[PDB]
Amino acid sequence: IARGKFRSLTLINWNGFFARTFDFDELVTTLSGGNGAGKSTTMAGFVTALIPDLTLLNFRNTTEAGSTSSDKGLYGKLKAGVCYAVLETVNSRAQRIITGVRLQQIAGRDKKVDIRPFSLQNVPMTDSVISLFTEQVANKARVLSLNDLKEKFEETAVTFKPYHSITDYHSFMFDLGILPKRLRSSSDRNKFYKLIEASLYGGISSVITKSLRDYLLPENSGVRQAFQDMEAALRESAESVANILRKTIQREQNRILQLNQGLQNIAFGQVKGVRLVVNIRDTHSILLNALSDQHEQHKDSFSEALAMLYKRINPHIQTIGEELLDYRNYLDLEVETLRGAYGWMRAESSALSTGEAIGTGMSILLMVVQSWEEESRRMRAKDILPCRLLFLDQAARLDAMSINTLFELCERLDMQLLIAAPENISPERGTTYKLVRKILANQEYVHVVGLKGFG
Amino acid sequence: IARGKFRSLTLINWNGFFARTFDFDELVTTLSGGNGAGKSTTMAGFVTALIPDLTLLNFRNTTEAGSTSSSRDKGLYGKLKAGVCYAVLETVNSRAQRIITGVRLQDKKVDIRPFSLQNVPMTDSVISLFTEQRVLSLNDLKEKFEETAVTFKPYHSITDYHSFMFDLGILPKRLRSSSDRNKFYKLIEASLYGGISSVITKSLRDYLLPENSGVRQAFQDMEAISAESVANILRKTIQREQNRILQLNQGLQNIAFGQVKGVRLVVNIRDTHSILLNALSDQHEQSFSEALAMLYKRINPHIELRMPQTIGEELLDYRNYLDLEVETLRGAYGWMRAESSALSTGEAIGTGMSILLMVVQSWEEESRRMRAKDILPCRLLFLDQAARLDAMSINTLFELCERLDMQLLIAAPENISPERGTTYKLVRKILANQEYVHVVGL
Amino acid sequence: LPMALEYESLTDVQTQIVTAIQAELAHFRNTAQPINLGAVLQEQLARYPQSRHFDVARIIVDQAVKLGMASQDHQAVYPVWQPIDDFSAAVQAHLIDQYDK
Numbered sequence: 001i002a003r004g005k006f007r008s009l010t011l012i013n014w015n016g017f018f019a020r021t022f023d024f025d026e027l028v029t030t031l032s033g034g035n036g037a038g039k040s041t042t043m044a045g046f047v048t049a050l051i052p053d054l055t056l057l058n059f060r061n062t063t064e065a066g067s068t069s070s071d072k073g074l075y076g077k078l079k080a081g082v083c084y085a086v087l088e089t090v091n092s093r094a095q096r097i098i099t100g101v102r103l104q105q106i107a108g109r110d111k112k113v114d115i116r117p118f119s120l121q122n123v124p125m126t127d128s129v130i131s132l133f134t135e136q137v138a139n140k141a142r143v144l145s146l147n148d149l150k151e152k153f154e155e156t157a158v159t160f161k162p163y164h165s166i167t168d169y170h171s172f173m174f175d176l177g178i179l180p181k182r183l184r185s186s187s188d189r190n191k192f193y194k195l196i197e198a199s200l201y202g203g204i205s206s207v208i209t210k211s212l213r214d215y216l217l218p219e220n221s222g223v224r225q226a227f228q229d230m231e232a233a234l235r236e237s238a239e240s241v242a243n244i245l246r247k248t249i250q251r252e253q254n255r256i257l258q259l260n261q262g263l264q265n266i267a268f269g270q271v272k273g274v275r276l277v278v279n280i281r282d283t284h285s286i287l288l289n290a291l292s293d294q295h296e297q298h299k300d301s302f303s304e305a306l307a308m309l310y311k312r313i314n315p316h317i318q319t320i321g322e323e324l325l326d327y328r329n330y331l332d333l334e335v336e337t338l339r340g341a342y343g344w345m346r347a348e349s350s351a352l353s354t355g356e357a358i359g360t361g362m363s364i365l366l367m368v369v370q371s372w373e374e375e376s377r378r379m380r381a382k383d384i385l386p387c388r389l390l391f392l393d394q395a396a397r398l399d400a401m402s403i404n405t406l407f408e409l410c411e412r413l414d415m416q417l418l419i420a421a422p423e424n425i426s427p428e429r430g431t432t433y434k435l436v437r438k439i440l441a442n443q444e445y446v447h448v449v450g451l452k453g454f455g
Numbered sequence: 456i457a458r459g460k461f462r463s464l465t466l467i468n469w470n471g472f473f474a475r476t477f478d479f480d481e482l483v484t485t486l487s488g489g490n491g492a493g494k495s496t497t498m499a500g501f502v503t504a505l506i507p508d509l510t511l512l513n514f515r516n517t518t519e520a521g522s523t524s525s526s527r528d529k530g531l532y533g534k535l536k537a538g539v540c541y542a543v544l545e546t547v548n549s550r551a552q553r554i555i556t557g558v559r560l561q562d563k564k565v566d567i568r569p570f571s572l573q574n575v576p577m578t579d580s581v582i583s584l585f586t587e588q589r590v591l592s593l594n595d596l597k598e599k600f601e602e603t604a605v606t607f608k609p610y611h612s613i614t615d616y617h618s619f620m621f622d623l624g625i626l627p628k629r630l631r632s633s634s635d636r637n638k639f640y641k642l643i644e645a646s647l648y649g650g651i652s653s654v655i656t657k658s659l660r661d662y663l664l665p666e667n668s669g670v671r672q673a674f675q676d677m678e679a680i681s682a683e684s685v686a687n688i689l690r691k692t693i694q695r696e697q698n699r700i701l702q703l704n705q706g707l708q709n710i711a712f713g714q715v716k717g718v719r720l721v722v723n724i725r726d727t728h729s730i731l732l733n734a735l736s737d738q739h740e741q742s743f744s745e746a747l748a749m750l751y752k753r754i755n756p757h758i759e760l761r762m763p764q765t766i767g768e769e770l771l772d773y774r775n776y777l778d779l780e781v782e783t784l785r786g787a788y789g790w791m792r793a794e795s796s797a798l799s800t801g802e803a804i805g806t807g808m809s810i811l812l813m814v815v816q817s818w819e820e821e822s823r824r825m826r827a828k829d830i831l832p833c834r835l836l837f838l839d840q841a842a843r844l845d846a847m848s849i850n851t852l853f854e855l856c857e858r859l860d861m862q863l864l865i866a867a868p869e870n871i872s873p874e875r876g877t878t879y880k881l882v883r884k885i886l887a888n889q890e891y892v893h894v895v896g897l
Numbered sequence: 898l899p900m901a902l903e904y905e906s907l908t909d910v911q912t913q914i915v916t917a918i919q920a921e922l923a924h925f926r927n928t929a930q931p932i933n934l935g936a937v938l939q940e941q942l943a944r945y946p947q948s949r950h951f952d953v954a955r956i957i958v959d960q961a962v963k964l965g966m967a968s969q970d971h972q973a974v975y976p977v978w979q980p981i982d983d984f985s986a987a988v989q990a991h992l993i994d995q996y997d998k
């Protein structure tokens with residue numbers, strides 16, 4: 001079963017980066033360099049190429065991760081004229097894909113910028129990704145606009161398609177397996193973006209802990225739909241629902257049952273394990289237990305009906321009726337970190353150290369994706385597979401033991417990691433891009449060097 | 456020519472430590488090892504040693520930088536064991552009188568009560584000044600000293616502890632009220648996590664330019680009138696505290712963080728308030744706090760409320776006249792207002808670290824008045840995860856202490872630590888399922 | 898509760914490798930003959946065993962840059978993955994031309 005992988009995030013006319021391609025390794029891609037180099041920003045460009053939605057795009061500083069105080073981060077990292085941020089994909093169908101974002105500053109009065117998602121299909125593996133947005137006049141490069149790209153391809157075996165609504169962009173990447181989740185509604189974009197954001201600043205992404213069940217659980221659009229209908233027929237059923245639930249929950253509980261097993265030999269500092277303990281609200285537990293053994297029938301809206309039933313078990317606190325259908329509502333998810341002390345302990349930042357928290361965090365993220373993908377097998381083909389990739393800016397927080405463990409993992413499940421070592425030492429396995437910000441005529445100018453194959 | 460510094464932090468019974476002594480370096484101390492080995496925690500008590508205030512002590516985790524979610528556990532409880540625990544420091548006054556400051560430690564809440572130990576001989580390892588052959592409790596220990604030669608003082612209210620440390624020669628500031636301490640701990644926090652202390656920037660003048668408590672008392676009484684004097688006062692109170700800063704700046708000129716070649720404090724005279732001092736300066740027409748409240752009631756702005764003496768009161772606090780700003784340098788446009796969303800991880804800390812010096816420096820001087828002229832307070836900050844700084848970036852930090860006569864406690868999980876200064880290596884391993892940490896130096 | 902105190906020394910002759918590599922590359926400064934790391938590397942590896950292969954790389958690179966910067970690096974052209982070894986490892990970087998001071 002073939003699985004797609006990104007090959008190059010080439011940034012154009014960005015801060016300190018003119019035409020610098022970035023080749024991603026099958027597994028790890030480490031950005032080596034000194035302070036204020038271009039590591040983070042390089043990823044910035046990446047992040048952008050996926051979620052070109054400015055609403056969510058906010059590049060704070062790794063010195064502020066819980067900053068619910070929404071100046072920005074995206075403007076500066078680009079220079080005057082036309083810029084880009086593109087991605088090279090190796091679709092499970094060995095199809096090269098050029099999903100990119102075009103950028104260009106705006107009237108200097110307010111740090112505002114513009115975005116136009118675009119893609120390029122059937123791009124002869126002979127031409128370099130960078131030789132798509134360049135010319136040669138008087139021996140000095142010339143970045144070309146999208147209307148320029150159009151013409152250079154208008155009549156060719158190569159197809160080009162500018163987009164208007166992010167959805168068009170997004171949905172496209174998903175159709176070709178670049179995106180794991182269905183990026184339909186905008187609220188969806190939040191979940192995704194925050195994961196990407198979460199991978200960055202590293203740690204136990206708080207925001208993905210409160211709505212912890214909003215990410216790991218498929219709310220079946222089949223349930224509500226098919227279920228309701230049964231009623232449309234009934235009018236012109238009893239506990240057949242009760243059966244549906246504890247089997248639908250048993251199902252997903254078996255889903256979660258395994259993903260955990262996928263995380264046992266993980267060792268970060270003291271953390272020797274991360275699980276997704278699935279608990280069922282007593283409130284609903286006795287209800288599921290109620291609509292089973294006992295039987296006090298009141299056949300007078302199944303929705304409405306069920307509601308009254310909550311009055312039975314609940315001597316506390318319509319809408320109760322319906323809500324009480326969805327799989328989720330009958331649960332209470334959580335996360336725990338295995339140690340040598342008190343066996344397993346609910347995940348808690350205040351109780352963990354920098355490293356221990358990042359790993360756990362990474363985990364939770366690993367799980368996020370290892371849920372969205374499969375939860376999408378239906379809406380996908382039997383021959384397409386999404387790409388799995390995460391981040392870990394300032395990966396120096398991880399020693400040797402921790403960092404290494406991160407590797408064996410991506411290898412464990414098939415993934416890629418664009419880590420960044422503010423320090424020069426780092427893993428020998430994988431690709432390494434050493435950066436050096438130079439000054440030529442008082443102009444930024446990053447200096448890249450490649451290394452891969454060592455192993 | 457005098458100097459005071461830190462000699463050793465001490466833990467007792469703490470989780471993973473039955474009793475350890477970390478001898479503070481002359482210039483820079485560093486902690487390295489494996490993720491979660493006992494680094495931060497070691498500093499945690501250092502922070503808990505200087506500020507034993509459960510209302511302020513809140514060790515969230517790095518990943519959470521600016522978390523206003525004070526709902527969770529302040530996290531310090533599980534950092535120690537149960538029963539009898541201790542936090543103690545070893546500092547040498549400008550007078551060289553070895554001092555011992557620290558505190559005892561013991562839902563999930565924590566009890567704490569401070570203490571001191573004067574006139575104690577040096578030839579005795581404080582380690583045995585709390586250990587017996589076991590730990591001999593607070594009650595056992597007071598007898599130890601009594602007859603012999605030493606001073607242990609069971610502190611009631613926290614105010615005194617500080618009011619004891621400052622009088623001796625440790626705290627670079629008069630921790631009088633909660634107001635005063637709240638700000639302190641915040642700086643220390645800012646040194647622990649790094650970057651531009653979101654808090655300090657929004658209230659710069661509150662951690663730089665002190666109050667001339669007098670201009671307030673003296674002024675009001677008199678009437679029991681004036682003129683261009685009160686106005687005159689402020690001016691020379693501003694230009695004075697302005698040249699103060701001027702110099703504080705001239706020190707941080709050869710900093711080197713990423714692309715930041717400098718930090719500064721742009722002291723500016725508010726448009727609003729500026730107009731007042733130009734009007735009272737040479738012109739005139741028609742509480743004296745009230746009179747002012749009216750002259751300001753001419754210059755028409757936006758926001759407009761107020762009591763005449765709460766206003767004049769605010770226009771007698773020279774500080775409300777100024778509006779500070781922190782700026783960084785770059786090969787680019789160079790002098791630009793610092794901005795978290797601008798500087799990279801490193802740059803951030805470098806700058807952030809700088810300002811804290813403005814704080815301490817300014818503070819130190821802010822109280823040379825109410826302190827023995829022979830003593831020179833000890834200055835020291837922190838920097839957990841310094842692994843985020845590259846060689847050049849770290850070098851500069853070092854060079855600074857040798858410029859600001861100071862000490863810096865850092866911590867890099869990184870296996871590569873400098874060489875300039877003693878360094879400790881910690882390795883935690885399971886033993887009888889009891890958290891244990893092996894402490895060795897390199 | 899026992900307690901002693903023992904210090905360990907870390908000896909990294911990595912400093913010599915650097916100095917020898919400094920002059921080895923510095924050698925290129927004197928002469929206008931650029932520093933093609935596709936050759937500087939493919940040759941230098943032949944000296945030290947593959948045990949400390951990686952480390953040697955970084956330093957030749959780290960050093961190869963503190964000395965200058967590619968010229969056709971502003972001509973926007975994807976640098977090809979110039980391979981080395983008989984196995985896998987490779988390097989990506991245009992020749993290093995004009996100097997800095």
Ligand SMILES: Nc1ncnc2c1ncn2[C@@H]1O[C@H](COP(=O)(O)OP(=O)(O)OP(O)(O)=S)[C@@H](O)[C@H]1O
Binds near residue numbers: 077422714
């Ligand atoms: N919004 C912005 N405005 C102006 N300059 C910016 C902005 N964002 C980034 N930069 C520039 O980019 C550099 C920082 O780049 P990054 O990619 O964050 O560096 P870094 O290599 O990640 O540094 P660390 O995190 O310290 S390891 C600075 O030197 C800035 O001049």
Ligand SMILES: Nc1ncnc2c1ncn2[C@@H]1O[C@H](COP(=O)(O)OP(=O)(O)OP(O)(O)=S)[C@@H](O)[C@H]1O
Binds near residue numbers: 269270354492496531
């Ligand atoms: N609130 C707590 N309750 C119980 N144990 C705790 C708590 N906070 C931390 N710990 C333990 O202390 C260890 C972390 O100690 P620290 O000294 O903070 O580690 P650290 O080495 O500073 O972390 P880095 O920066 O990630 S390398 C973990 O292994 C935990 O088991």
Ligand SMILES: [Mg+2]
Binds near residue numbers: 355496839
């Ligand atoms: Mg820590």
Ligand SMILES: [Mg+2]
Binds near residue numbers: 062800801
């Ligand atoms: Mg950064």
